[PDB]
């Protein structure tokens, strides 16, 4: 799986409160986190499904 899947979630500098998903390698599942709205890193998905299909098993 891509290495970006191992990066911690990144909220960014913008001040929105948008729910996104990131893969948590420690637990093996995608979890929710608050995204600020801009400059998203790659371990940031709009759905748990997209996240699992891209990072599952990393």
């Amino acid at each position: 799986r891509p290495d970006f899947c191992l990066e911690p979630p990144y909220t960014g500098p913008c001040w929105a409160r948008i729910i996104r998903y990131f893969y948590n390698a420690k637990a093996g599942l995608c979890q929710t986190f608050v995204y600020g709205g801009c400059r998203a890193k790659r371990n940031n998905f709009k759905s748990a499904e997209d996240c699992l299909r891209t990072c599952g098993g990393a």
């Binding site: 909220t11 001040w15 409160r17 600020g36 709205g37 801009c38 400059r39």
Partner: protein, 239 residues
Amino acid sequence: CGVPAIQPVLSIVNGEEAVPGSWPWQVSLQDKTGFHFCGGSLINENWVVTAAHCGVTTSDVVVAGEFDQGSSSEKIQKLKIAKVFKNSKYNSLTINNDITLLKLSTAASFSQTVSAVCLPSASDDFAAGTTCVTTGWGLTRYANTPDRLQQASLPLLSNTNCKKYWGTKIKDAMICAGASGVSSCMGDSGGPLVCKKNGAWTLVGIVSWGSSTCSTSTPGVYARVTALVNWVQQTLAAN
């Protein structure tokens, strides 16, 4: 516009609870489940101005006349969004031109707690040091959002002073304010930064970005409405 039926009491991290309904143009942008993700400002009965990075869609809703998001009995107006007009010049890399207009499916019913903020003229000059106000339901500590609407008085900063911290990240459609003991924060984006123009509260900025920890000693950055208002007027006129 710009004249609340209920006057606010002056004197977001380190801000203060607002008088219920004293910022009648403040709206809460929520998803279909009621989750607040951004703020916004009513500019008339059919349009709301917010930030482009909020990524609003027609599935989201505009909640007007709200004060306590934790109150199920509080009377509010849940308004559907007919169309979203994101400024095509919004730069997703620099965050410049961070503004979006929302056209409501059904007009908002103006009242003592729901009305519009005034828009500035492209040529208006709000001097640095001018004390303005920003409002919203963003975090009060860098964590869940406060139930009741918050407010904070803060000074506008000159581009030169803002750049002393942010350098070249400050673009022409941005205006800074804060670094004075208060700070906008997660959940405040899209909300208003208003200053008085002939006594009427006028939209000078739209909460955009800043310190990643909402530091109160760092300049907050807002979309500069004077640099984007012509786009606003043009969009309304064509729709």
